[PDB]
Amino acid sequence: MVTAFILMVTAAGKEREVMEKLLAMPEVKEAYVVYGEYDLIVKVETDTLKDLDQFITEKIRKMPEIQMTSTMIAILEHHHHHH
Amino acid sequence: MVTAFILMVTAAGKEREVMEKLLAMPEVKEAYVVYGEYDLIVKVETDTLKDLDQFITEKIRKMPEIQMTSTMIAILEHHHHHH
Ligand SMILES: [K+]
Numbered sequence: 635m636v637t638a639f640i641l642m643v644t645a646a647g648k649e650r651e652v653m654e655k656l657l658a659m660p661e662v663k664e665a666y667v668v669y670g671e672y673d674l675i676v677k678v679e680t681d682t683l684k685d686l687d688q689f690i691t692e693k694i695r696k697m698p699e700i701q702m703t704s705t706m707i708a709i710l711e712h713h714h715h716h717h
Numbered sequence: 718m719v720t721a722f723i724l725m726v727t728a729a730g731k732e733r734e735v736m737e738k739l740l741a742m743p744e745v746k747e748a749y750v751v752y753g754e755y756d757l758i759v760k761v762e763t764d765t766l767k768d769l770d771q772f773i774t775e776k777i778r779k780m781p782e783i784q785m786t787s788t789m790i791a792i793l794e795h796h797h798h799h800h
Pocket residue numbers: 656657658659660661662663
């Protein structure tokens with residue numbers, strides 16, 4: 635599984651809008667509007683790296699309200715070499 | 718209760734050592750080794766902001782392996798209207 639924590643800057647006044655639009659997506663497990671250097675921190679989980687890159691490409695990158703991002707990934711695979 | 722995510726830059730090779738020392742702390746609820754702008758992400762809950770401030774500037778300094786932190790205070794999250 636791949637977990638991504640994405641820090642985001644949004645357009646002014648669109649923080650909650652972005653938070654809820656993201657939470658309506660199945661891949662988004664948690665989301666927080668925050669006070670700090672960024673406006674939100676969002677937790678995403680996908681089965682594969684391919685799934686995460688597709689999620690970012692079709693969802694995140696096509697939401698004009700999201701203006702800046704910083705992505706962090708944790709890959710948790712207990713059998714990465716089991717093929 | 719205050720909820721926050723502390724993003725950390727750590728010296729290389731000390732992530733898990735620090736992660737385990739962090740997870741053992743009562744304030745620390747979740748910790749993840751990650752790849753990206755930061756090396757470690759930790760979710761903390763404290764009674765007050767003053768407590769969070771002391772954790773960030775005093776407790777974290779007990780681990781010099783942690784070189785930089787940026788903290789995001791949650792002001793809205795996924796339990797809004799959903800609790
Ligand atoms: K969701």
